[PDB]
Design a protein around this ligand. Structure first.
Ligand SMILES: [Mg+2]
Lengths: 784, 136, 121, 68, 63
């Protein structure tokens, strides 16, 4: 074990922005680095395209057209050919588009005429484009990682990536199959779910069921591969075909290596398509005749030093994986439970959770993340009693009372803890028909009805709805306690210890805890100074991904919450010697070392998959064990095809009671957002030096009392917009149908136009009540 | 069909005949979360426990009032018009179909008092939409 | 009737199935979803007896599940229902071939018993 | 001509008053419940001992949709 | 954006007969989501049907 790749599971997100560094983003390598960064630009800006164009007019170019202006005194195919190229623009925009933008120019300085025609072609393609979030991969030297590989002259590193997409080859997603798997219970999933049959796993038929025999179903799989070396920084496409070798080219990603040996992986462009235009993606997950450009696969490397030592990075202890996902439309808003938390829970046994020790930093992420959901979900802005209590405390600089483990603060801690849902799923239930085959835990809280209504009076709820107000893996079963999301057993255990007073916390933490934001900034500094960059990189790649509910989810789904899928999953250390912050782990996926050549690359279970196949897979000599030994495409095949259908289905689930409004995955696919139009009507103070102030004329804005002025600001700050309305999803126009299904259909083209949430400053809130940092949703529709 | 007609531009939302068939209303649920002042002597004040309501600064208490006051609800969502439940279609046509039975359950707008608005900016007379779905 | 090859070679795997009318929860309240009725006739009297139930079981519709007659010689005659199917709301359409919530029909089945009482005792 | 047979259904003698009149298997029915139903002492054996409504409950509701 | 539409093909033989071929029967919407659910009036659609004007010039050897 001489060299390893980090992160062990890299993440790259699709975007229609270009695959170049200045106009793309990077997957986080340090958790919480930029939660209040009001300079973030997640969409391509006019400014960025102007600077790109300027840098392409170096250096020859202004001279060689002045020359051609004399050599001129229209152009000429040959003339324009030598301009284009000299420009380094061939890779962003088709040759003929650049050419024909100059072929039709009005000659008779002429640089500026050329600049303007070229800027319009870039702006047509990329202005306001969803930037790609790329993953950098690193080679670390071992003894156990410390120090990145440093190349000297004569040294070389060669990366190899092989990816696939199998969504169209796999089974319907109806619900999580592990909901019926026998278990002792994990940190992620109580054994009560399976034991008491709370949300039974469904059988699932095949997608594209008319394609029969395994050898013909191989056409349904898209795959590609490539290599780059620190000896060529030319970008290489990962390009497949669907159906596999009429026929569409599918860009699954792009890879580059720099001269320091760092691999950069870009995902695809977010292009989903059917083989026939009339095949509409009307189901949330399972649409036949469709393909998308999501992928996942195997990342390996070879180090070759100057003397001639060669090191292969290919075993599962040292190799890595990469998975591409839908965009993150609110990168600074963290899911309440993340994919990293699933990794953390997977290695814990439910029986032993009462031996867990808890610092306050293990509890703070729950409260902090739930607090920050107000920027993407109405219920957490106006209908969440815990968030309101946090605001009460902040308003008195008394947030630090929550860090008090003494007996005089216990009532305060328990009141908060008691509003959270218990992932044992054994509260707020009545046992129906005990001892019968009819035996059932029936919730006496608020249920989420099916769309298939019955006109019989609902049973009145007698228990209060617990937090958070999000649906869960058992959505399909009205009355099941698993219809609603519970933080997982090990994180509920931390919260229980917190309430009991059985937690530790440092004085330095208390001194930074007068408000939740002040404490959050402190913990963010602790991540920044933590020395183990390799394990922070591992965690940062997954701390922005969702960790439930899994129906199927957003990026990845339920197989990730089982230790079965990892070849290694060990606690290593706290983030800081004195502050755990949920910890740092060494984890690695179980990988099939033959990759695309595996004999199980195209394996399945026949006409259906069922929980019995998962049960069989526990035995590693089973003919089912391959389910956990991932080949390219295996992590993402569970998800919806195409992904935009699943994203358009990932919003509100309305109950007959209006409030609170349940939301699925709002941290990454927001549901209620604060649009730019409103930002421009509360951002200014009454003394702002602008002829228009918060949408009023300067005169009107200063004619009103200061009280009424601050009130108008708050009223605008409080106007939250349905995220689905930040673009045309089928509801626009006279007698437009709108509705669930039209949103699914339109999201295939409109995903790239949905609002992107970005932190933005409020310079002088005054007494308005608006914070100094707000989170503003940007789209073309919502901007005015 | 007498509700909003959306344009590619989000704002302002055009509305047909909103004075008699409202489009965006202030539901009873929000009224019960701004109608009380902080000095009220009740176990629950503006949807908060007595302790929390009185523990916060007066400025913040009045800000929470105004945020609730500003939450306007789509009038079609004041009864079940086809959008309720997991994977419910919703949409324009289901609205037309369901209004035959649900017209009698749509929210009714009634003037209501705010006895002491303080400096929150809420008027002494507010117009509140009453229906069973929006009441809590 | 059925070869063991179907099960053993997984030729048509049985699927799981959820409840119809799934929004009615607890066994006690789901009893409202069952239409039932009963009657008796004898050879002394040929007056026809309707088997009428209610849906939801005891708004509310009368469901004629059948009619029973007995003749002078002791033969029972069983008439089925009128073929009336209905939903609890007119806007609930039966768009699925098998599983439509909010609906009821007058199909029924049940138990047929008798007692023979002879002249002597 | 394929023969004449004497056959009778398994019946619950309590009929409408059977304590199994309203039995089910919880949120879903699956082949596992039928496998358990085989053993006549198990708590799923009631599936074969008909109470009123058990022959036709499987069929399409309403039957007209299934006929069409 | 923008689709090429073959509306027809023309050729002439050495005796001066014009032969006019219609298009390949390709119809399409500018977005795949736009379905042609009406018998006559579907927006966002185009087809390769056409009609137009046919003229000629005869040039004899004398001039
Ligand atoms: Mg997010």
């Amino acid at each position: 074990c001489q060299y390893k790749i980090y992160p062990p599971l890299g993440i790259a997100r699709v975007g229609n922005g270009p695959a170049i560094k200045p106009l793309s983003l990077s997957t986080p390598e340090v958790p919480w680095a930029h939660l209040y960064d009001t300079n973030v630009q997640y969409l391509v800006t006019q400014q960025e395209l102007e600077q790109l164009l300027e840098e392409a007019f170096g250096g020859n170019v202004i001279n060689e057209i002045s020359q051609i202006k004399t050599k001129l005194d229209k152009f000429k195919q040959e003339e324009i050919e030598t301009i284009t190229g000299l420009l380094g623009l061939s890779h962003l925009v088709p040759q003929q588009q650049l050419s024909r933008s100059l072929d039709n120019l009005e000659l008779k300085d002429i640089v500026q005429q050329i600049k303007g025609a070229l800027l319009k072609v870039l702006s047509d393609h990329y202005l306001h484009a969803v930037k790609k979030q790329a993953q950098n991969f690193y080679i670390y030297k071992c003894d156990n990682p410390v120090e990145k590989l440093k190349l000297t002259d004569g040294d070389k590193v060669t990366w190899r990536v092989e990816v696939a997409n199998k969504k169209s080859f796999w089974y319907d997603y109806n619900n999580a199959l592990d909901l019926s798997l026998h278990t002792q219970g994990s940190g992620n999933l109580s054994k009560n779910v399976s034991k008491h049959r709370l949300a039974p796993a469904m059988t699932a038929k095949r997608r594209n069921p008319n394609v029969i025999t395994n050898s013909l179903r191989k056409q349904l799989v898209i795959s590609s591969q490539g290599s780059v070396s620190s000896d060529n920084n030319t970008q290489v496409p990962l390009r497949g075909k669907f159906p596999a070798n009429e026929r569409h080219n599918v860009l699954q990603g792009s890879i580059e290596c720099d001269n320091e040996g760092v691999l950069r992986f870009y995902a695809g462009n977010g292009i989903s398509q059917a083989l026939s235009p009339s095949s509409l993606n009307t189901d949330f997950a399972d649409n036949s005749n469709w393909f998308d450009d999501i992928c996942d696969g195997r990342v390996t490397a070879v180090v070759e030093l100057k003397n001639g030592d060669t090191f292969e990075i290919q075993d599962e202890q040292s190799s890595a994986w990469v998975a591409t996902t839908p965009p993150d439309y609110a990168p600074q808003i963290e899911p309440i439970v993340t994919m990293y938390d699933m990794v953390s829970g997977a290695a814990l046994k439910e029986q032993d959770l009462d031996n867990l020790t808890t610092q306050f930093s293990d509890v703070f992420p729950i409260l902090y993340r739930l607090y920050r959901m107000q920027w993407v979900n109405q219920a957490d802005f106006t209908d969440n009693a815990v968030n309101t209590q946090i605001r009460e405390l902040n308003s008195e600089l008394g947030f630090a009372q929550l860090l008090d483990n003494s007996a005089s603060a216990k009532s305060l801690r328990e009141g908060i803890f008691n509003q959270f849902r218990n992932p044992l799923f054994d509260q707020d239930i009545d046992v129906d028909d005990p001892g019968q085959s009819s035996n059932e835990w029936v919730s006496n809280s608020r249920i989420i009805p099916s769309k298939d209504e019955t006109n019989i009076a609902a049973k009145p709820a007698t228990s209060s709805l617990k937090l958070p107000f999000y649906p869960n893996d058992g959505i399909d079963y009205p009355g099941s306690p698993v219809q609603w999301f519970a933080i997982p057993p090990f994180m509920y255990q931390h919260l229980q210890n917190w309430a009991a007073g059985d937690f530790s916390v440092t004085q330095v933490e208390k001194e930074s805890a007068n408000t939740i934001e002040e404490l959050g900034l402190f913990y963010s500094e602790q991540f920044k100074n933590s020395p183990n960059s390799a394990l922070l990189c591992a965690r940062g790649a997954l701390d922005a991904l969702y960790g439930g509910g899994f129906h199927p989810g957003v990026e990845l789904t339920w197989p990730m919450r089982h230790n079965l899928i990892y070849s290694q999953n060990d606690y290593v250390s706290s983030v800081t010697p004195e502050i755990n912050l949920l910890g740092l782990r060494e984890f690695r996926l179980k990988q099939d070392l033959q990759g695309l050549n595996s004999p199980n690359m195209y394996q399945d279970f026949g006409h259906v998959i069922a929980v019995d196949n998962v049960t069989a897979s526990i035995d590693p000599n089973s003919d089912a064990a391959w389910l956990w030994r991932s080949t390219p495409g295996d992590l993402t095949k569970w998800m919806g095809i195409p992904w935009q259908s699943e994203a358009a289905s990932c919003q509100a689930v309305y109950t007959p009671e209006d409030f609170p409004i349940p939301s699925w995955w709002a941290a990454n696919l927001p549901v209620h957002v604060l649009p730019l139009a409103r930002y421009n009507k509360f951002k200014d103070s009454q003394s702002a030096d602008l002829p228009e102030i918060n949408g009023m004329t300067h005169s009107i804005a200063q004619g009103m009392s200061e009280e009424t002025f601050e009130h108008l600001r708050l009223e605008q700050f409080s106007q939250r917009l349905d995220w689905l309305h930040t673009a045309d999803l089928g509801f626009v126009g006279y007698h437009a149908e709108g509705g669930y299904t039209n949103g699914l259909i339109q999201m295939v083209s409109q995903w790239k136009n949905m609002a992107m949430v970005m932190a933005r400053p409020v310079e002088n809130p005054g007494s308005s009540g608006i914070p100094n940092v707000v989170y503003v949703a940007y789209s073309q529709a919502d901007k005015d």
